[PDB]
């Protein structure tokens, strides 16, 4: 079938300067956001954010709304709980983040699940790869670990990730087939600009590609120049495609000694590009 995932990325933030907290959740299939929930919205609901989810009937919207609202309430409580575990002041704002999801292998069969939490930007508690055990970051998280062991939380996560997560994923893939199941290769180009009297900058671009995953590497005589290379973060175009570039300063006159190697799942085979 192919490699694919369904994930939810949730952020709960305490706001003592507003006397409340906020929860936001977003859902993705692969790189494509499809739902959101925002507790600060008027009439907070699970809302569609891709066209191909819009046809879900009201019972889907109602159910997902009940469950995400439930989750918002629990994560708000968790913020208070964690403040207690770390003995933190009431005055400061704190963040609990949660990411969970399922992964299908290259054969379309379930390969991987995950369920993990961070507090104030650092790992707190994570379901291990075996889906049977938990890794706590510190003594606070060990309190939560003990609770979740006693509640057989891992067994409930296994059932969700094997059943509902994968089944939903596969229905989303069908509904969004014309965008989710076809990769678009990068449009590439290599620019050249003298950047001092000593050097010339070669920049290898990839634009217009999806999915986001891509490799751009400069080589000289079959050898990666990744130390000296400037490589920007992959960045979204805003229309479901992505952009990336990689740059290298090379000696004037030596431009043809260097090639940019592009790998992407939309390509028949990898590209070897030169300033041309």
């Amino acid at each position: 079938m192919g490699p694919h995932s369904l994930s939810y990325f949730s952020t709960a933030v305490s706001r003592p300067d507003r006397g409340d907290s906020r929860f936001i959740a977003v859902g993705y299939v692969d790189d494509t956001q499809f739902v959101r929930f925002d507790s600060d919205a008027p009439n907070p609901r699970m809302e569609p954010r891709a066209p191909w989810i819009q046809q879900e009937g009201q019972e889907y919207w109602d159910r997902n709304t009940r469950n995400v609202m439930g989750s918002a309430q629990i994560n708000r409580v968790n913020l208070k709980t964690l403040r207690g575990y770390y003995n933190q002041s009431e005055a400061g704002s704190h963040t609990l983040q949660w990411m969970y999801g399922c992964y299908l292998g290259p054969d379309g069969l379930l390969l991987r699940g995950y369920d993990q939490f961070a507090y104030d930007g650092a790992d707190y508690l994570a379901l291990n790869e075996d889906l049977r055990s938990w890794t706590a970051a510190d003594m606070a998280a060990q309190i939560s670990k003990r609770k979740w062991e006693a509640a057989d939380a891992a067994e409930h996560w296994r059932s969700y990730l094997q059943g509902t997560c994968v089944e939903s994923l596969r229905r989303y893939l069908q509904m969004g087939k014309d965008t989710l199941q076809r990769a678009e290769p990068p449009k590439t180009h290599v620019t050249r600009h003298p950047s001092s009297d000593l050097g010339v900058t070669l920049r290898c671009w990839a634009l217009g590609f999806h999915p986001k995953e891509i490799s751009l590497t400069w080589q000289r005589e079959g050898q990666d120049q990744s130390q000296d290379m400037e490589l920007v973060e992959t960045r979204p175009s805003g229309d479901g495609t992505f952009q990336k570039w990689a740059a290298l300063v090379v000696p004037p006159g030596e431009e043809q000694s260097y090639t940019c190697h592009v790998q992407h799942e939309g390509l028949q085979e990898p590209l070897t590009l030169r300033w041309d």
């Binding site: 469950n67 629990i74 409580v77 964690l82 609770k147 409930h156």
Partner: peptide, 9 residues
């Protein structure tokens, strides 16, 4: 489909 159980920390 969103999870239908969130656990208390």
């Amino acid at each position: 489909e969103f999870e239908d159980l969130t656990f208390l920390a």
